[PDB]
Amino acid sequence: SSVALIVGVTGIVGNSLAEILPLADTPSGPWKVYGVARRPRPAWNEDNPINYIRCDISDPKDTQEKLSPLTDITHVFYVTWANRSTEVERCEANGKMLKNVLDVVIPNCPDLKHISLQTGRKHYVGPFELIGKIETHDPPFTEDLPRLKFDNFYYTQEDLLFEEVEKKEGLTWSVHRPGNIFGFSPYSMMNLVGTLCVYAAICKHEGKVLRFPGCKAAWDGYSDCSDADLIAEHHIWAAVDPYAKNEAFNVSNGDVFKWKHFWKVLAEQFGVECGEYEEGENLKLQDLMKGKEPVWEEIVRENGLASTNLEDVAVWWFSDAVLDIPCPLDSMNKSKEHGFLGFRNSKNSFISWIDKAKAYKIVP
Numbered sequence: 309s310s311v312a313l314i315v316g317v318t319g320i321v322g323n324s325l326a327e328i329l330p331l332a333d334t335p336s337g338p339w340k341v342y343g344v345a346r347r348p349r350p351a352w353n354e355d356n357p358i359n360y361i362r363c364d365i366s367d368p369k370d371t372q373e374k375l376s377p378l379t380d381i382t383h384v385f386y387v388t389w390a391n392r393s394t395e396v397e398r399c400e401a402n403g404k405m406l407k408n409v410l411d412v413v414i415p416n417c418p419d420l421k422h423i424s425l426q427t428g429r430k431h432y433v434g435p436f437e438l439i440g441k442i443e444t445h446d447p448p449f450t451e452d453l454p455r456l457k458f459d460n461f462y463y464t465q466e467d468l469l470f471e472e473v474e475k476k477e478g479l480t481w482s483v484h485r486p487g488n489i490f491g492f493s494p495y496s497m498m499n500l501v502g503t504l505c506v507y508a509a510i511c512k513h514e515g516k517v518l519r520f521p522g523c524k525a526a527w528d529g530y531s532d533c534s535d536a537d538l539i540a541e542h543h544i545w546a547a548v549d550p551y552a553k554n555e556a557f558n559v560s561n562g563d564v565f566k567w568k569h570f571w572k573v574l575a576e577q578f579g580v581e582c583g584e585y586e587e588g589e590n591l592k593l594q595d596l597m598k599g600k601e602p603v604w605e606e607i608v609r610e611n612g613l614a615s616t617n618l619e620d621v622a623v624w625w626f627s628d629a630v631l632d633i634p635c636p637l638d639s640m641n642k643s644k645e646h647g648f649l650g651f652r653n654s655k656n657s658f659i660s661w662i663d664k665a666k667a668y669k670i671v672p
């Protein structure tokens with residue numbers, strides 16, 4: 309029987325894994341599912357038939373307590389991280405988090421088959437504070453080129469993963485590298501779609517034009533993205549397909565787009581006048597949206613929305629870090645050569661995730 313541990317179940321990918329793993333048509337099903345996060349279970353995560361567990365995986369004592377009784381786990385899906393002010397601090401905090409989970413699950417789960425680790429495109433472009441400032445390999449990024457000669461918590465987690473799986477014979481791993489994720493999660497630390505929806509809603513409320521808060525290269529250069537459900541399918545495929553074992557894979561939608569085109573779609577979905585890129589202007593959402601909490605409360609009250617905190621539902625720093633840089637492309641050749649043919653139309657994915665935020669009454 310298949311039993312999953314989703315580590316970060318209320319996250320942008322964890323929440324897709326919570327909806328997909330229990331479905332009857334899912335490979336290796338029927339799946340029993342345990343979902344871990346620190347907060348109490350939110351209302352928008354309830355619609356999934358998972359066993360929700362409150363646990364802080366940065367706490368070794370808490371991890372030992374909550375996870376040691378889950379002896380029936382066969383597959384681990386690790387979809388979480390902790391942000392710190394520098395990459396060296398991110399290596400320490402994220403290495404400990406992964407090690408705390410693995411040190412407990414491996415000796416306590418005799419039927420444990422696979423550990424799926426989510427990382428990302430920063431494997432190739434570098435940590436947040438070095439992006440655009442270092443020499444990278446040339447795009448499209450392929451999986452097995454050498455690591456950058458700078459600290460990166462993904463390299464720490466991979467090396468920890470490789471040495472952890474040695475403790476159990478027949479234990480396999482996979483690494484999943486998405487770019488910017490289009491998904492649903494009002495609790496995610498990095499939710500571009502959710503943040504853009506809140507921005508569009510505020511513009512509609514204040515009768516302002518939907519100004520583009522990014523650079524020229526993000527506006528009219530090519531971009532790509534990774535649909536959250538597609539990433540969830542990619543985790544599952546690697547977890548059950550023996551030809552996918554012990555490999556790192558990119559996971560992006562299979563097409564490209566331009567923010568210039570998606571700007572129309574976003575404006576049309578919230579009934580706002582479509583603004584554009586302005587050759588001046590250096591617009592930042594972190595600055596534009598400072599002190600909009602009362603305006604968000606007006607929007608919440610007037611449209612019968614779920615009660616959310618502006619700071620949870622709109623991570624302004626992340627939307628600015630995304631739109632103020634070029635989006636170098638990655639390659640899906642390794643995934644496709646291994647039998648994974650999943651893909652998404654990125655524009656349809658974008659509309660689908662906007663509509664999910666609306667359907668859960670997060671935005672108007």
Ligand SMILES: NC(=O)c1ccc[n+]([C@@H]2O[C@H](COP(=O)([O-])OP(=O)(O)OC[C@H]3O[C@@H](n4cnc5c(N)ncnc54)[C@H](OP(=O)(O)O)[C@@H]3O)[C@@H](O)[C@H]2O)c1
Nearest residue numbers: 316318319320345346347364365387388428489496497498
């Ligand atoms: N989101 C993106 O656009 C994006 C793009 C590329 C790569 N990635 C990478 O994907 C990986 C996973 O991130 P994600 O974006 O999927 O995460 P996310 O959407 O921010 O979700 C994190 C999840 O883990 C939980 N969590 C956080 N800290 C925890 C802790 N100490 N103990 C237990 N649970 C904890 C969260 O709930 P609580 O806070 O309630 O605990 C939530 O359920 C990271 O390496 C990230 O860099 C993300």
Ligand SMILES: C/C(C=O)=C\CC/C(C)=C/C=O
Nearest residue numbers: 526629630631633634635636
């Ligand atoms: C390249 C791009 C947008 O244009 C967005 C990605 C920004 C990054 C790599 C943020 C960290 O996950």
Ligand SMILES: [Ca+2]
Nearest residue numbers: 427428429430
């Ligand atoms: Ca990344």
Ligand code: NA
Nearest residue numbers: 535537657660
């Ligand atoms: Na989709």
